[PDB]
């Protein structure tokens, strides 16, 4: 009979991400994500431990639900006080929906490339190779989102960089990426720092940076209804 909501989300993601028809399909996908709750995935909301995080445990974990050539579908689970650092989604669309907790999502884009003015100074100061590499960007928004918020969308050309901070305890979100990342095809995940020199939208300076030493994501089992071909 009636398929599970997560199966319906996967089915609709496949139809949307395989052009006329795209906006209507994306709207339907957003409406399905709006209805999704953590209990529909058998994920109980996680609350703070109030203990420090030991060095051998990741700050973030990921449950994979499904992927096709057109999209990837899963859940990121952030522990208290953690962040997913600022990163891009080259050539991709993304849709996320908060399942529990509160996250602060900062949304940014790279701009067109203009060079850093010679006298510009930063705190902390930049090394010479960093001064050569910094590029202009725009900070478009920075707001808090909960399960009562709508889904958040990004596209290849707008809000393509985002940072996600767990606010006042653990949080989790469902994420759809379309197409998935593919490093062997020029679609990798790059990380950035926004720099403080010495009102939104507002121009910022962006520095591409390696994955942070204290950030990584481990898989954990997905407990909810399964998506079937």
């Amino acid at each position: 009979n009636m398929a599970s909501l997560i199966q319906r989300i996967a089915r609709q993601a496949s139809l949307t991400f395989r052009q006329p028809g795209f906006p209507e399909n994306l709207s339907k996908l957003k409406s399905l994500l709006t209805q999704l709750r953590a209990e529909d995935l058998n994920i109980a909301p996680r609350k703070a431990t109030l203990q420090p995080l030991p060095p051998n445990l990741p700050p973030v974990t990921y449950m994979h639900i499904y992927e096709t050539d057109g999209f990837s579908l899963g859940v990121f689970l952030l522990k208290s006080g953690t962040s997913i650092p600022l990163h891009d989604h080259p050539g991709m669309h993304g849709m996320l929906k908060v399942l529990y907790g509160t996250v602060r999502i900062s949304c940014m884009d790279k701009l067109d490339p203009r060079a850093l003015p010679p006298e510009q100074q930063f705190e902390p100061p930049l090394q010479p190779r960093e001064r050569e590499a910094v590029r202009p960007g725009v900070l478009r928004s920075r707001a808090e989102y909960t399960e009562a918020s709508g889904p958040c969308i990004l596209t290849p050309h707008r809000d393509n960089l985002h940072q996600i901070d767990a606010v006042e305890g653990p949080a989790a979100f469902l994420d759809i990426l379309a197409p998935p990342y593919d490093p062997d095809d020029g679609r990798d995940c790059h990380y950035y720092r926004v720099l403080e020199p010495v009102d939104l939208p507002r121009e910022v300076w962006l520095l591409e940076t390696p994955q942070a030493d204290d950030f990584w994501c481990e898989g954990e089992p997905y407990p909810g209804p399964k998506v079937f071909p």
């Binding site: 990342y181 490093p183 990584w216």
Partner: peptide
């Protein structure tokens, strides 16, 4: 170690 993932690209999973 580095793993190619659908969901975080070339990811250092450690």
């Amino acid at each position: 170690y580095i793993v190619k993932t659908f969901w975080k690209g070339s990811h250092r999973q450690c």
